[PDB]
Design a protein around this ligand. Structure first.
Ligand SMILES: [Cl-]
Ligand SMILES: [Cl-]
Ligand SMILES: [Cl-]
Length: 163
């Protein structure tokens, strides 16, 4: 465990993270994809061997000894708001199981279903709240990665609000 488990947020490429493992915002087919997924494919391509997994699940593959947790959020273009919300919550619960099983003291995590799977809606609060619901009972240091300056400010405020 971390001595004083924390949440932090950084605005940078998650492929440059300083944590003991990474969560990929994966597709269900284990394809290179785009955005975070493409960055993860460039940095850790070995981790895409048999990484395909269904929506709402996470599957860990090692790149050397560095764990890549492939977490598949729903594409809100295809899911109803109700079913997508249930699958997005479930993906983060499977992330928390993997982080715990791996025994890591820190994890780098993007906001699932906020980019090309958002169905064109702002899901910062929805995705971050499901992240907190899953991760709050874990003792890993969590570092959230984002790219947008306004998102950085809103995620940082949400973390500080809980103290
Ligand atoms: Cl960067
Ligand atoms: Cl996405
Ligand atoms: Cl972002």
């Amino acid at each position: 465990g971390a001595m004083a488990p924390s949440y932090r947020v950084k605005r940078m490429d998650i492929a440059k993270n300083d944590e003991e493992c990474v969560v990929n915002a994966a597709n269900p087919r284990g394809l290179p994809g785009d955005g975070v997924c493409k960055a993860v494919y460039k940095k850790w391509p070995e981790s895409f061997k048999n990484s395909a997994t269904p929506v709402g699940t996470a599957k860990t593959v090692m790149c050397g000894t560095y764990p890549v947790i492939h977490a598949v959020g729903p594409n809100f273009s295809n899911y109803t708001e109700s079913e997508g919300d249930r699958e997005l919550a479930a993906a983060y619960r499977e992330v928390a199981k993997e982080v715990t099983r791996l025994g890591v003291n820190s994890v780098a995590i993007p906001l699932l279903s906020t980019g090309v799977y958002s169905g064109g809606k702002d899901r910062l609060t929805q995705s971050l709240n499901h992240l907190f619901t899953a991760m709050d009972s874990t003792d890993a240091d969590v570092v959230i990665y984002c790219r947008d300056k306004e998102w950085e400010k809103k995620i940082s405020e949400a973390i500080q609000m809980r103290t």
